[PDB]
Design a protein around this ligand. Sequence first.
Ligand SMILES: Cc1cc(CNC(=O)c2cc(C(=O)NCc3ccc(F)c(C)c3)ncn2)ccc1F
Ligand SMILES: [Ca+2]
Ligand SMILES: [Ca+2]
Ligand SMILES: [Zn+2]
Ligand SMILES: [Zn+2]
Length: 169
Amino acid sequence: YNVFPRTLKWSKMNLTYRIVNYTPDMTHSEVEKAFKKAFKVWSDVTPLNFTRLHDGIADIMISFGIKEHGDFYPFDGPSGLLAHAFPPGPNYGGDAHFDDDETWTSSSKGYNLFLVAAHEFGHSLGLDHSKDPGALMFPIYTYTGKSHFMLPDDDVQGIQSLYGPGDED
Ligand SMILES: Cc1cc(CNC(=O)c2cc(C(=O)NCc3ccc(F)c(C)c3)ncn2)ccc1F
Ligand SMILES: [Ca+2]
Ligand SMILES: [Ca+2]
Ligand SMILES: [Zn+2]
Ligand SMILES: [Zn+2]
C-alpha cells in the first residue's frame, strides 16, 4: 500500500518542461535561455533533472497569456499580477503562466523573465512564499541590481527539504 506523501512534491527526479508559446517582448532564444537558466538554479542544488520537450505533455507546461487563459486565476492587464505557477500534482500541477500584458526582459527593465521564472519554478517544485525579504521566494519582486545571481540560502534550504541536495559538489 501507499499513503500520500507528507509534502507536495514531485516523486521523480526526471522532470520535463515545454514552452507552449512566446511573449512578443523577447526573441525565442532569449526566452529559452532565461527558462533554461531558471531551471538550472534549482537543478544545481538538488538531484532534479529538467528536460525540454518541444511538444506533447510535459510536467511543467509554460505559457504566456492574458486575462482569462484557462484557469481560476485570470490575469489583470498591465501591472498587478505578473505570473503564477501551480504546485506539484497531476494535469495542470506544476504549470507556469506569465501575464503577457506585462513587459518581459532579459535586463533590469520591466520584469526580468529569468528572475520571475526562477521564482515561479520554485512554486512548480513545491515552494510557497518566504518571509525572508532577500529570498527568491519572497512574495514581492525585488530586483537587486547585482551582476551575478546566487540562490539565497533560505531558498536552498527550502528546496533541499523537499528533494535533498543531490551532489553537494
Ligand atoms: C544576472 C542576474 C542577477 C540577479 C540578482 N538577483 C536578484 O535581483 C534577486 C531578486 C530576488 C527577488 O526579487 N525575489 C522575489 C521575487 C522574485 C521573482 C518574482 F516573480 C516575485 C513575485 C518575487 N531574489 C533573489 N535575487 C537577478 C537577475 C539576473 F539575470
Ligand atoms: Ca498584470
Ligand atoms: Ca503539469
Ligand atoms: Zn494561469
Ligand atoms: Zn510567488
